[PDB]
Each structure stands twice: as C-alpha cells, then as structure tokens.
C-alpha cells in the first residue's frame, strides 16, 4: 500500500540565510563515549493529522536544520590520527517522498511489526547516509514521519535535539538549543590518568571474531504493555514506602518490567540477570555536557541480582537495586570511563565494547531503552505537535523500549519483545 516516488540527498542550504558555504574538509572525531555506543541504525515513527506542511515546505526546512546540524548531512571516515570520525563532507541525508493508497486511520493504531519497516528507510542495507528520513503522505492527508539514524553520532537526547531543530526551521523559529559541534574540546583525559572502576566485562570486552540454522526457535513477539497512571501511582507508592523522597517512575517501570521479564522467561532462580539502564551523564559530569551538545554522553548502570532473589523478593527491593547501581554512575565513573578509554589498555588488549548490535540473545540479561523524554509536543513543522509516534520493529527478546502516552494522560507504554511461549507467563505475572 506504500509508494516511493522519490529519493534523493538533501544538503545543508547556507544560501537560505546568506551564511558562508560550510569548509567540506571539516572532521569532527568521534568521542570515547560516542565509540561506547551502538554502531547501529534506530527507527522512530511519528504520525500527523491532516493538514500538514507539503514535501516541498518539510523538505526546506530540512535543508534550513541541516546548517546547525552539518553532522547528519555527513560521513562516517577517519581524522589525521586515524581515529573514527564524521566528515562534515555536506553529501547529504536521505529525504524519501511516499504516498499509502489508505486513510491512516483505517490501519491506526500502528502495531510494532514487520508492516512499520515500510514507513521509514532501511538501517540495514548498508546506507551510507547517517540521516534518513521518510515522509509518508496517507489517503486523507495524514502524513507519517519515519526517522532512521546512525546511533554512533547521537544518543537519544542529541538525535531528538535534531527532530525538534527540523520542525523549529520548518516553522522558521531559531532553533533551540543552540547546538553543540566541537566534540574534541570535550571528555580529555585527567593528567595523570586515574581509573578508579573495572570496566573490563563493562564498556568493553576482549575481541572476539548462516541462514536456516535458525527453524527449532521460537519466535519473537513485540507486546505492548500499558503502565496505566494508577497502576504507577500504586507501583512507585510500594517502591517509595518508608523513603525520604519517592522514587521515580522510570526505575519503578524497569525495576517492574525486569521481574516480569524474569518470571516470564521461567529461569532456574540461582541463574545470573541483570538490567543494562542508559545514565545521561550531561547533567551528571563537572564541568556539565551543553543541552545543544550533539554528540552521545551515554554509560549505563547495570544492576546484577540472581532470578530467585528478583522474582521471590518484593518489586521494591528490585527498585532499591536499581536506585543505588544508577546514583554510581556519577562525574567519577564517567571520568573513570574516559581515562580507562585513553590509557592504550584497549589498544594492547584488543578490547571493543559491550554494547553490540549485531545480537539478539540478550537472556538471561534485559536492556531498557527509555524514550520517555522523546520530543512529542515540541515536534510541531506548523501543521501542530503529532498525535502518534512509535519505535520500529526490533524483534530482539529482552530489549524494552519505554513510550510515553500519545495521550499525554501520564500513563508509559512499554514495547517488550518476547518469545511467544513466554507471553501467557509474562501476562499472568504483570499485575
């Protein structure tokens, strides 16, 4: 039901502004914290109500967004040392043009399956563009904004300054934050180099280097899971009880999710699990990363339990692990982190990182992916915010990705990937 009419690379238009040609030599380095990271393409949805902005209005206010953000125009190379670096090359991001032979509200709401892959460009063709962007106009003019973007350059935070600052340009308001590019002036290393925390079996690991073997395996189902305002209310009212101060909503859902994750898949309790949970370290490393800063400033905390002790244990006890493994992630470790990252250690004992996207078999282990902070009423191109938006599909059991409500009703909506003899257990389980 979904037409591509057209494909092409959208550039950075300085000329819009009069502003001088951007240098096409210029090359940013990526930082020991952006190489932390995934080297791996993530997909967003976002739906509109008609009307919206046409193509041609989307298409230069993408050009306008492109000046402050010159890296999703950019390549993946090297710099003059040989470190991984984008080359600000101004080649362009992909702008695909569609149209669906449907009204969007006879298919709404959109469900996290293979069909979605269709609403946004591929991440797993091998794109040499680090920026694609796919709008999709429906039968009565609804229109679809699908995003596919290479998570080296940006975590969630930066890739969502980026959507904002598309829409801003759109509009023709300034765009805000003000971004930040010089990514070498950030996370030197401490003179001397101080590493006060193990990150071996951590950030990084020793280097370590078929279709149809697969037939006997269960297949993957992504659930969404509906965190209801009173359920959390009650939820966090358990977690908090006895505190100073209650916890938070995002702990108390992946403290929740974790438990329900580990009961579902039905362990042997002295088997080892753990929850890998994002730390943004922006607000949490001295000097503090800029708001506008456009890179990735990502480590996770990684409390470690075993299944017997999480599922036989109250939901509170899970929080209380949680909530202690997150307030370590502090300046120290980040520093930690980076100095370890500079020490040549990686180097000589051939490490690479933990975080591998080229894997599916996370059990008996879970990642939370939070989007809570996704930019949903911010996102206005002049045609109004979006009613709907939605992860793409990615089947990889254990890996949760948390919504807010397209409601704004202050419910979370969980996309957990489970193997299908597992859903019935994990049903039972969640209240």
Same mark, same amino acid.
């Given at each position: 039901?979904?037409?591509?009419?057209?494909?092409?690379?959208?550039?950075?238009?300085?000329?819009?502004?009069?502003?001088?040609?951007?240098?096409?030599?210029?090359?940013?380095?990526?930082?020991?914290?952006?190489?932390?990271?995934?080297?791996?393409?993530?997909?967003?949805?976002?739906?509109?109500?008609?009307?919206?902005?046409?193509?041609?209005?989307?298409?230069?206010?993408?050009?306008?967004?492109?000046?402050?953000?010159?890296?999703?125009?950019?390549?993946?190379?090297?710099?003059?040392?040989?470190?991984?670096?984008?080359?600000?090359?101004?080649?362009?991001?992909?702008?695909?043009?569609?149209?669906?032979?449907?009204?969007?509200?006879?298919?709404?709401?959109?469900?996290?399956?293979?069909?979605?892959?269709?609403?946004?460009?591929?991440?797993?063709?091998?794109?040499?563009?680090?920026?694609?962007?796919?709008?999709?106009?429906?039968?009565?003019?609804?229109?679809?904004?699908?995003?596919?973007?290479?998570?080296?350059?940006?975590?969630?935070?930066?890739?969502?300054?980026?959507?904002?600052?598309?829409?801003?340009?759109?509009?023709?308001?300034?765009?805000?934050?003000?971004?930040?590019?010089?990514?070498?002036?950030?996370?030197?290393?401490?003179?001397?180099?101080?590493?006060?925390?193990?990150?071996?079996?951590?950030?990084?690991?020793?280097?370590?280097?078929?279709?149809?073997?697969?037939?006997?395996?269960? $297949?993957? =189902?992504?659930?969404? #899971?509906?965190?209801?305002? !009173?359920? /959390? @209310?009650?939820?966090? +009212?358990?977690?908090?009880? &006895?505190?100073?101060?209650?916890?938070?909503?995002?702990?108390?859902?992946?403290?929740?999710?974790?438990?329900?994750?580990?009961?579902?898949?039905?362990?042997?309790?002295?088997?080892?699990?753990?929850?890998?949970?994002?730390?943004?370290?922006?607000?949490?490393?001295?000097?503090?990363?800029?708001?506008?800063?456009?890179?990735?400033?990502?480590?996770?905390?990684?409390?470690?339990?075993?299944?017997? $002790?999480? =599922?036989?244990?109250? #939901?509170?006890?899970?929080? !209380?692990? /949680? @909530?202690?493994?997150? +307030?370590?992630?502090?300046? &120290?470790?980040?520093?930690?982190?980076?100095?370890?990252?500079?020490?040549?250690?990686?180097?000589?004992?051939?490490?690479?990182?933990?975080?591998?996207?080229?894997?599916?078999?996370?059990?008996?282990?879970?990642?939370?992916?939070?989007?809570?902070?996704?930019?949903?009423?911010?996102?206005?191109?002049?045609?109004?915010?979006?009613?709907?938006?939605?992860?793409?599909?990615?089947?990889?059991?254990?890996?949760?990705?948390?919504?807010?409500?397209?409601?704004?009703?202050?419910?979370?909506?969980?996309?957990?990937?489970?193997?299908?003899?597992?859903?019935?257990?994990?049903?039972?389980?969640?209240?």
């Amino acid at each position: 039901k979904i037409t591509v009419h057209s494909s092409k690379a959208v550039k950075p238009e300085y000329g819009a502004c009069g502003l001088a040609p951007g240098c096409t030599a210029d090359v940013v380095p990526l930082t020991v914290l952006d190489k932390a990271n995934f080297d791996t393409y993530i997909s967003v949805i976002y739906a509109f109500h008609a009307p919206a902005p046409p193509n041609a209005v989307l298409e230069a206010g993408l050009g306008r967004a492109l000046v402050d953000y010159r890296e999703w125009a950019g390549r993946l190379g090297v710099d003059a040392s040989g470190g991984r670096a984008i080359l600000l090359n101004d080649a362009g991001a992909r702008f695909v043009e569609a149209t669906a032979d449907v009204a969007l509200d006879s298919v709404m709401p959109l469900k996290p399956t293979s069909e979605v892959l269709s609403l946004h460009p591929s991440g797993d063709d091998g794109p040499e563009e680090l920026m694609l962007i796919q709008v999709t106009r429906f039968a009565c003019g609804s229109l679809v904004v699908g995003f596919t973007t290479q998570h080296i350059v940006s975590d969630g935070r930066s890739t969502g300054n980026f959507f904002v600052a598309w829409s801003q340009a759109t509009r023709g308001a300034a765009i805000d934050p003000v971004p930040v590019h010089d990514r070498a002036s950030f996370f030197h290393p401490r003179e001397p180099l101080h590493v006060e925390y193990e990150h071996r079996g951590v950030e990084f690991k020793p280097c370590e280097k078929v279709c149809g073997a697969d037939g006997d395996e269960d $297949e993957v =189902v992504v659930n969404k #899971v509906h965190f209801s305002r !009173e359920f /959390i @209310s009650k939820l966090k +009212a358990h977690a908090s009880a &006895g505190a100073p101060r209650p916890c938070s909503t995002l702990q108390c859902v992946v403290a929740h999710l974790w438990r329900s994750m580990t009961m579902a898949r039905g362990l042997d309790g002295g088997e080892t699990t753990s929850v890998a949970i994002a730390v943004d370290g922006r607000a949490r490393m001295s000097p503090q990363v800029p708001d506008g800063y456009t890179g990735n400033v990502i480590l996770w905390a990684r409390p470690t339990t075993t299944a017997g $002790e999480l =599922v036989t244990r109250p #939901v509170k006890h899970a929080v !209380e692990l /949680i @909530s202690r493994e997150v +307030a370590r992630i502090n300046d &120290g470790y980040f520093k930690s982190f980076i100095d370890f990252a500079n020490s040549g250690a990686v180097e000589k004992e051939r490490l690479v990182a933990t975080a591998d996207a080229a894997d599916m078999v996370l059990s008996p282990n879970i990642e939370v992916d939070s989007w809570l902070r996704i930019p949903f009423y911010d996102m206005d191109f002049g045609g109004g915010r979006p009613f709907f938006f939605m992860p793409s599909y990615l089947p990889v059991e254990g890996l949760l990705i948390l919504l807010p409500s397209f409601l704004g009703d202050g419910s979370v909506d969980a996309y957990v990937p489970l193997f299908s003899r597992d859903m019935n257990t994990f049903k039972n389980c969640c209240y």
